[PDB]
Design a protein around this ligand. Structure first.
Ligand code: P1G
Ligand code: P1G
Ligand code: P1G
Ligand code: MG
Ligand code: MG
Ligand code: MG
Ligand code: ZN
Ligand code: ZN
Ligand code: ZN
Lengths: 274, 274, 274
């Protein structure tokens, strides 16, 4: 970890003096889900480049969403960009110092569960942190008690209540396709998985595969934030050597557009119940 | 590896000139098992801070245990503290240069095998080194032949004889609960595993999960030491989403106390047969 | 990645001005397969030490093989030597800048599939990149579009045509033992796997285990090279605690000799069909 506690304080102090907004909820927008910030009222935006200590991208937007004061990350950071996890998760700790209590994380992922279909929304019930198995963890290094404990529990990371409410809200939305729910596995990237890797991951019990999120959740749980999140299934991963095609970022961004209005609508409603 | 061969020599030379003790056996005490050093006779202690080149913590204690000359590490180092494995395992190589022939490793672990119960003692028959799958290995870097070979075998790491004797000794102890035996899997930490991760690990064939030991064993085998070890089962990991509770370091330390007298007693007897 | 684009250019320019050879095919020789370079005609060799920017070993040999212009790496680099993957794979990108279109990779591996026998040749149909699960990837860091895309597909890494031709060619060779085909899994090393690790890997769907290759393939696919490869099964890994013996580098090198003439013969013929 290359940031001191004071670094975190300085950055939060800077934000508090540049906007009157006082967020209670923070949202990290995954790839293609950035349009969510366009629904905020009384909004104020800061490019990451203008914020002291912020990792290099990228906009941070404050505002009101369906009655709730929020702060959203339009664009996030990734391990595959070369950033260590202490940089990838720097914003989560700043949010805590701002007074945020709940964190919503979203991402684009590849579907491992055969029952999934492109466009599906999968609530995240649990995760598998592969980089963590080898020590790549945002918490690696001396522990800072002002944030949390040395050995944080992670079995209850994704708030159960929020998931119930989430299912309730989706009911009131009157959607034809059911709201999915499963386990998200994170791996480094940036390349897409081979057939052997996809089969393996599925056998490990994962329902969706991605390249982010997990480190943010771990840090959020460590400092005390309530966590909720979901994945937009952007493609069904190739499970056999009879590959009619192969994963590509184009289709991932395409799928991101088709389900924009939908995803944005869902998150907007969930604010009500927090 | 940031230590030269001379660094290892200098440190061993320093220890040999500050104590008359000449250990044949070395013991690394895991969390909560530190009371073991209190049974040594003609003991001499050195805080790690007073020993040149030693990683920063932490006491090294020399003495006689049930007739055998020993040197024990009261407190060990971990990857989750930010230390690279070449630092975590520095003492093992120093021990070899001191004349030590056998290494006993102990640790606190979470139980994956359903038949295990808190308090159980599980002899370590084999291990799974997850960090090693990605290259995080104390042997990474140019090989130093003065210590061992470039490609060391690890399938016979845990001495079979010692395990037989271990079972024999436990018999003479007249314990009601049987002595367990299984596979130990090491992951980075510092957070506790999620339900998905626990299920996965069990399916990989692991019986107990921890955050240390494996790197020490690998280095000990590389330089020629005989190895024996075991885990104190401090908690039964949550295997379902009907979690009545969740892992916590408090209970781990609590369990460490209840089985202190027992664990300490067992190790004391095992010295006889080496 | 510690090499700039210009570094790659400078090195390729140097090679182009020191030899009249213009390779279309590149071959990376694994351990014990180095004798392959002895069949090249009109050959020219450069020790890696004489080539600007080349990682420290090691010879690069240009020449004609059964009618095809080739460049071969007699000796490769490994993660267990302490080299980051951007160093291990530096040559692959230089080859691309030289005008190479196809890459052949070979290695020595341990057999996981029970049907395999020492000496068997296993064509590589797919792979499992364990280090990649944690982020150790030659592509980690800012993407260089002059080489390839940010998110490269890997499900079609091993050219299907080449595999068909490979099987065809092996037919014309009239060999008694069939040509094997399976999945190669790469782990860091340098130690050999324990029994628990071997069982685990097999259950993940791997047929052979090694310490190289995968990173080279990923980089070759990223910059557009056609890829073909195979493993020489140098030993049957210990799958039970009734180990009659244990893996050793001696036997691996021994097996490498016995199948030299065979392996060398096979590769020589495959050139014809490219
Ligand atoms: N590991 C993996 N990641 C995928 C796949 N499909 C989508 N992704 C995610 O979207 C991008 C590639 O199109 C990657 O970058 C990030 C985007 P995120 O910030 O997680 O929304 O995770 C990966 C996929 O199939 N596998
Ligand atoms: N991975 C993991 N580690 C655990 C668990 N229970 C105990 N541990 C070990 O004890 C501490 C947490 O209480 C951690 O720190 C070290 C202690 P050690 O030096 O291995 O005796 O390994 C972990 C557990 O459930 N999972
Ligand atoms: N992981 C692993 N690697 C093995 C085994 N048998 C052979 N190897 C490979 O050969 C050497 C050890 O003798 C190691 O170094 C490299 C050689 P390579 O450049 O891949 O041909 O991969 C390993 C084996 O059983 N397991
Ligand atoms: Mg800046
Ligand atoms: Mg000191
Ligand atoms: Mg040089
Ligand atoms: Zn200002
Ligand atoms: Zn002195
Ligand atoms: Zn010259």
């Amino acid at each position: 970890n290359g940031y001191t506690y004071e670094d975190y304080q300085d950055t939060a102090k800077w934000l508090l003096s540049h906007t009157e907004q006082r967020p209670q909820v923070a949202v990290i927008c995954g790839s293609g889900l950035g349009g969510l910030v366009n629904k905020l009222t009384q909004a104020q935006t800061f490019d990451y480049s203008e914020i002291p200590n912020f990792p290099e991208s990228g906009r941070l937007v404050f505002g009101i969403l369906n009655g709730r004061a929020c702060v959203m990350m339009q664009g996030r950071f990734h391990m595959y960009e070369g950033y260590p996890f202490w940089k990838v998760t720097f914003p989560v700790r700043v949010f805590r110092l701002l007074g945020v209590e709940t964190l919503v994380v979203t991402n684009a992922a590849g579907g491992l569960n055969p029952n999934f279909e492109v466009g599906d929304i999968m609530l995240i019930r649990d995760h598998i942190n592969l980089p963590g198995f080898s020590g790549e963890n945002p918490l690696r290094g001396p522990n800072e008690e002002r944030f949390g404990v040395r050995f944080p529990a992670m079995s209850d990371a994704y708030d159960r209540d929020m998931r119930q409410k989430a299912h309730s809200t989706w009911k009131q939305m009157g959607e034809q396709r059911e709201l999915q729910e499963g386990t998200y596995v994170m791996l480094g990237g940036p390349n897409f998985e081979t057939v052997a890797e996809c089969r393996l991951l599925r056998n490990l019990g994962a329902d969706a595969v991605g390249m982010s999120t997990v480190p943010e959740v771990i840090v959020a749980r460590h400092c005390g934030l309530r966590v909720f999140g979901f994945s937009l299934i952007t493609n069904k991963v190739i499970m056999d050597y009879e590959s009619q095609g192969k994963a590509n970022h184009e289709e991932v961004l395409e799928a991101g557009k088709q389900a924009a209005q939908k995803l944005e609508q869902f998150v907007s409603l969930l604010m009500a119940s927090i």
